[PDB]
Amino acid sequence: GIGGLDKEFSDIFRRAFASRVKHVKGILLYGPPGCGKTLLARQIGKMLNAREPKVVNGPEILNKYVGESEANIRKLFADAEEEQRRLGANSGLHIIIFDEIHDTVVNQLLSKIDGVEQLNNILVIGMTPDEKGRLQILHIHTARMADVDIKELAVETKNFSGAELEGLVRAAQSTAMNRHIESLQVTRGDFLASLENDIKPAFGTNQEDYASYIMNGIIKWGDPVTRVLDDGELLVQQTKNSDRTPLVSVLLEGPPHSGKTALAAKIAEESNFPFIKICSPDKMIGFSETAKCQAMKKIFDDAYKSQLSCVVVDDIERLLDYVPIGPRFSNLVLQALLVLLKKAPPQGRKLLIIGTTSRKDVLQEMEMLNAFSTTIHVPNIATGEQLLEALELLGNFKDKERTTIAQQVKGKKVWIGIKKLLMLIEMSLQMDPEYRVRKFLALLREEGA
Amino acid sequence: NSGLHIIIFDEIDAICKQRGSMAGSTGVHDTVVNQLLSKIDGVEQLNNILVIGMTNRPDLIDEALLRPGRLEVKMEIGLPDEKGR
């Protein structure tokens, strides 16, 4: 009985056991915490032999230093070698497992396996949620002792794992017996904010933070929004049925303070893939160029090893470390990125790489644009119609005061992007109610309409 | 099963290197976690007694021995706030 890991369980038993039923000397597994490591170590041993001895080895193994583990490590194997040498012909298999792995044991240990004697016919394996398994953790540990739900503290698992969850449950008595002490009526075992935070430290690899890049869901203020989105999502769809374009390169660009970074996250989330990942300079701050490129490899190879996935790279003029005053940048990072865009996926895999650009002209000058394909202009707001419709979608202003700015429809013409505007309404509101709208227009004019 | 019997083992920093791998080549008994580790949970779990610890710099010790079940509890006192002080 194994939750998940069947494809990995499939291949692992054949190559070891299918051959025997030169033979491999040993197999080793690397697994993350919370994987049910010990149960798997039990099961593979059980499956091997009916009653083939299942031997366990301690974490402390090199105890008894006076002069023992040099023997006692050796003796346990030696007994297995002893049994082997006693009767080699009619087929002897002995099992020892050493869980959770200096001078002497390195050469001795390995030597024991292949030294002087053939040493064959034995194997040793080292390993370094299952919410139903976690339910067993309840019904063995919790049953030992308005109750918790049958399932809540098993599905609230993400933050923790049962292997560490053994504190609040022990304290769970104290949760209402701590009367600073005649006895309050016996308790129910009540669970109340006894979920993770009493003892929260644990390992679950959160690493999300994807939503943060988009703080506001994008609002449709205009035909251009639907334009950009449908023009992009037809691409992400045609990859699915694609042939001879496993990579697809797109560069979408607009002027600054026009949110296109969350926008790309929007188009990528909407078309749901196995894998998504986001390359943010925010993450890699203060890194050497050769570390930065390495980072891009490390994510990008993760995307390859999925069957297919899109990824995003944002704000690359900063990723490139560009400055105009005289041009300087890291060249190798650029060239790396550029070769990715022409790098094929291995046999069948396919991906969509997209990228965001404040300024096009610099890169057009750097001849990186041809590697990109089928690019997308995201405009700034041109017109007050679109403006009024935008704040209508949001609803910052009351319609009455909204009249006042409405008084001008193409009284002036606007170059504005959404990000500065969205921050600008906030200061406008911050000022006294007579002058909120008074100042909003003032600043809309401050940037020259 | 009277468990009034407790000890202060202070300054765990010194007695233990996390697995003993720290400081490279060291005496075999320069660090024994293994006996006292084995003492509490190794031979059998002991429910009669409580061990206490003080470390000014925990992070040296923490990864190996503060694995849950050896100690699943870990606590930190910060300095007082204005009313605390």
Next chain:
Amino acid sequence: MAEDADMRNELEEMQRRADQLADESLESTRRMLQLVEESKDAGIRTLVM
């Protein structure tokens, strides 16, 4: 490399009984030096008389 590590390490004293108990055997060997000679003393003078 450019590596210089020059290091030291400390000693493990083999349990050499680690108690004074050695004395009692040493007391027996005292007495066999001590209590033996007067046998000869009185022996030679017993032989004189």
